[PDB]
Protein backbone atom coordinates (compact mmCIF):
# COMPACT_ATOMS: atom_id res chain seq x y z
CA UNK A 1 0.00 0.00 0.00
CA UNK A 2 1.06 3.64 -0.78
CA UNK A 3 -0.57 6.43 1.29
CA UNK A 4 -3.37 8.24 -0.57
CA UNK A 5 -2.97 12.01 -0.91
CA UNK A 6 -6.17 12.46 1.14
CA UNK A 7 -4.79 10.60 4.16
CA UNK A 8 -1.67 12.77 3.84
CA UNK A 9 -3.77 15.95 3.81
CA UNK A 10 -5.96 14.58 6.65
CA UNK A 11 -2.83 13.93 8.81
CA UNK A 12 -1.34 17.34 8.05
CA UNK A 13 -4.66 19.20 8.74
CA UNK A 14 -5.10 17.46 12.08
CA UNK A 15 -1.57 18.35 13.13
CA UNK A 16 -2.01 22.01 11.85
CA UNK A 17 -5.34 22.19 13.81
CA UNK A 18 -3.51 20.90 16.83
CA UNK A 19 -0.55 23.38 16.45
CA UNK A 20 -3.07 26.15 15.97
CA UNK A 21 -4.99 25.08 19.17
CA UNK A 22 -1.72 24.91 21.10
CA UNK A 23 -1.02 28.57 20.00
CA UNK A 24 -4.58 29.68 20.93
CA UNK A 25 -4.48 27.86 24.38
CA UNK A 26 -1.03 29.09 25.24
CA UNK A 27 -1.85 32.77 24.31
CA UNK A 28 -5.10 32.64 26.37
CA UNK A 29 -3.47 31.07 29.37
CA UNK A 30 -0.68 33.68 29.26
CA UNK A 31 -3.04 36.57 28.85
CA UNK A 32 -5.26 35.48 31.70
CA UNK A 33 -2.37 34.76 34.04
CA UNK A 34 -0.06 37.65 33.30
CA UNK A 35 -1.75 40.43 31.44
CA UNK A 36 -3.88 42.83 33.52
CA UNK A 37 -6.92 44.61 32.01
CA UNK A 38 -4.95 47.85 31.36
CA UNK A 39 -2.31 46.05 29.38
CA UNK A 40 -4.50 43.77 27.24
CA UNK A 41 -3.32 43.85 23.59
CA UNK A 42 -0.56 46.29 24.42
CA UNK A 43 1.56 44.58 21.71
CA UNK A 44 -1.28 46.19 19.58
CA UNK A 45 5.71 44.23 15.90
CA UNK A 46 4.83 42.40 12.71
CA UNK A 47 4.48 38.62 12.57
CA UNK A 48 6.13 36.32 10.06
CA UNK A 49 2.60 35.63 8.69
CA UNK A 50 1.95 39.40 8.04
CA UNK A 51 4.67 39.12 5.28
CA UNK A 52 2.71 37.13 2.60
CA UNK A 53 -1.10 38.05 2.37
CA UNK A 54 -4.43 36.11 1.75
CA UNK A 55 -3.52 24.75 -5.13
CA UNK A 56 0.29 25.48 -5.10
CA UNK A 57 3.57 24.01 -3.85
CA UNK A 58 4.07 27.68 -2.93
CA UNK A 59 1.30 27.80 -0.31
CA UNK A 60 2.83 24.64 1.08
CA UNK A 61 6.25 26.32 0.87
CA UNK A 62 5.16 29.26 3.04
CA UNK A 63 3.36 26.97 5.50
CA UNK A 64 6.64 25.15 5.82
CA UNK A 65 8.57 28.40 6.51
CA UNK A 66 6.05 29.53 9.10
CA UNK A 67 6.34 26.24 11.05
CA UNK A 68 10.14 26.31 10.78
CA UNK A 69 10.27 29.74 12.39
CA UNK A 70 8.69 28.23 15.46
CA UNK A 71 10.43 24.86 15.83
CA UNK A 72 13.05 26.26 18.18
CA UNK A 73 11.09 28.89 20.07
CA UNK A 74 8.41 26.29 20.78
CA UNK A 75 10.26 24.14 23.25
CA UNK A 76 10.43 27.27 25.45
CA UNK A 77 6.62 27.84 25.64
CA UNK A 78 5.98 26.55 29.15
CA UNK A 79 9.12 28.45 30.57
CA UNK A 80 7.21 31.65 30.86
CA UNK A 81 4.54 29.99 33.12
CA UNK A 82 6.76 29.97 36.07
CA UNK A 83 8.49 32.57 38.10
CA UNK A 84 12.24 32.27 37.40
CA UNK A 85 12.13 28.97 35.53
CA UNK A 86 14.40 28.15 32.49
CA UNK A 87 13.33 25.26 30.18
CA UNK A 88 15.37 22.21 31.30
CA UNK A 89 15.68 20.57 27.79
CA UNK A 90 13.40 17.64 28.91
CA UNK A 91 11.55 15.80 26.23
CA UNK A 92 11.31 18.16 23.31
CA UNK A 93 7.92 19.27 24.52
CA UNK A 94 5.11 17.21 23.19
CA UNK A 95 5.43 20.37 20.90
CA UNK A 96 8.04 19.19 18.36
CA UNK A 97 4.55 18.23 17.01
CA UNK A 98 5.69 21.03 14.73
CA UNK A 99 8.48 18.66 13.56
CA UNK A 100 5.72 16.14 12.77
CA UNK A 101 3.74 18.80 10.85
CA UNK A 102 6.92 20.03 9.15
CA UNK A 103 7.75 16.57 7.77
CA UNK A 104 4.06 16.02 6.81
CA UNK A 105 4.19 19.22 4.76
CA UNK A 106 7.57 18.26 3.15
CA UNK A 107 5.91 14.88 2.34
CA UNK A 108 2.89 16.62 0.70
CA UNK A 109 5.27 18.78 -1.36
CA UNK A 110 7.25 15.87 -2.85
CA UNK A 111 3.88 14.43 -3.80
CA UNK A 112 2.54 17.53 -5.53
CA UNK A 113 5.90 17.97 -7.40
CA UNK A 114 15.15 31.70 -0.50
CA UNK A 115 17.03 34.93 0.16
CA UNK A 116 15.54 36.32 3.37
CA UNK A 117 15.52 34.16 6.54
CA UNK A 118 12.88 35.08 9.16
CA UNK A 119 13.55 33.87 12.69
CA UNK A 120 11.71 34.63 15.94
CA UNK A 121 13.35 35.78 19.11
CA UNK A 122 13.39 33.33 21.94
CA UNK A 123 10.90 33.66 24.81
CA UNK A 124 12.21 35.08 28.21
CA UNK A 125 12.39 33.73 31.81
CA UNK A 126 10.30 44.46 28.22
CA UNK A 127 10.29 40.63 28.68
CA UNK A 128 6.50 40.30 29.49
CA UNK A 129 5.52 42.33 26.47
CA UNK A 130 7.96 40.54 24.17
CA UNK A 131 6.61 37.13 25.27
CA UNK A 132 3.10 38.48 24.82
CA UNK A 133 3.92 39.59 21.19
CA UNK A 134 5.61 36.34 20.40
CA UNK A 135 2.54 34.35 21.55
CA UNK A 136 0.34 36.64 19.47
CA UNK A 137 2.54 35.86 16.37
CA UNK A 138 2.65 32.10 17.06
CA UNK A 139 -1.15 32.13 17.05
CA UNK A 140 -1.39 34.27 13.90
CA UNK A 141 1.21 32.10 12.11
CA UNK A 142 -0.42 28.83 13.02
CA UNK A 143 -3.87 30.13 11.88
CA UNK A 144 -2.20 31.09 8.61
CA UNK A 145 -0.63 27.58 8.25
CA UNK A 146 -3.99 25.86 8.84
CA UNK A 147 -5.55 28.23 6.35
CA UNK A 148 -3.00 27.73 3.60
CA UNK A 149 -3.07 23.91 4.08
CA UNK A 150 -6.94 23.85 3.79
CA UNK A 151 -6.78 25.81 0.58
CA UNK A 152 -4.29 23.31 -0.81
CA UNK A 153 -6.34 20.24 0.37
CA UNK A 154 -9.54 21.44 -1.23
CA UNK A 155 -7.93 22.10 -4.68
CA UNK A 156 -5.83 18.90 -4.58
CA UNK A 157 -8.25 16.37 -3.21
CA UNK A 158 -11.65 16.44 -4.92
CA UNK A 159 -14.70 16.18 -2.64
CA UNK A 160 -12.60 17.35 0.29
CA UNK A 161 -14.52 20.56 0.54
Curated annotation (Swiss-Prot):
GO molecular function terms attached to this record: growth factor activity; growth hormone receptor binding; hormone activity; metal ion binding
InterPro entries from the UniProt entry: 4_helix_cytokine-like_core (IPR009079), Somatotropin (IPR034975), Somatotropin/Prolactin (IPR001400), Somatotropin_CS (IPR018116)
Compartment(s) of residence: Secreted
Cysteine disulfide links: 47-137, 154-161
One GO cellular component term: vesicle
Protein family (similarity comment): Belongs to the somatotropin/prolactin family.
Miscellaneous: CSH1 sequence only differs from CSH2 sequence in 1 aa.
Protein purpose: Produced only during pregnancy and is involved in stimulating lactation, fetal growth and metabolism. Does not interact with GHR but only activates PRLR through zinc-induced dimerization.
Family matches, as PANTHER family: CHORIONIC SOMATOMAMMOTROPIN HORMONE 1-RELATED, SOMATOTROPIN,PROLACTIN
Assembly, per entry: Can be found in a monomeric as well as dimeric form.
Name of the protein described by the UniProt record: Chorionic somatomammotropin hormone 1
Natural source organism: Homo sapiens
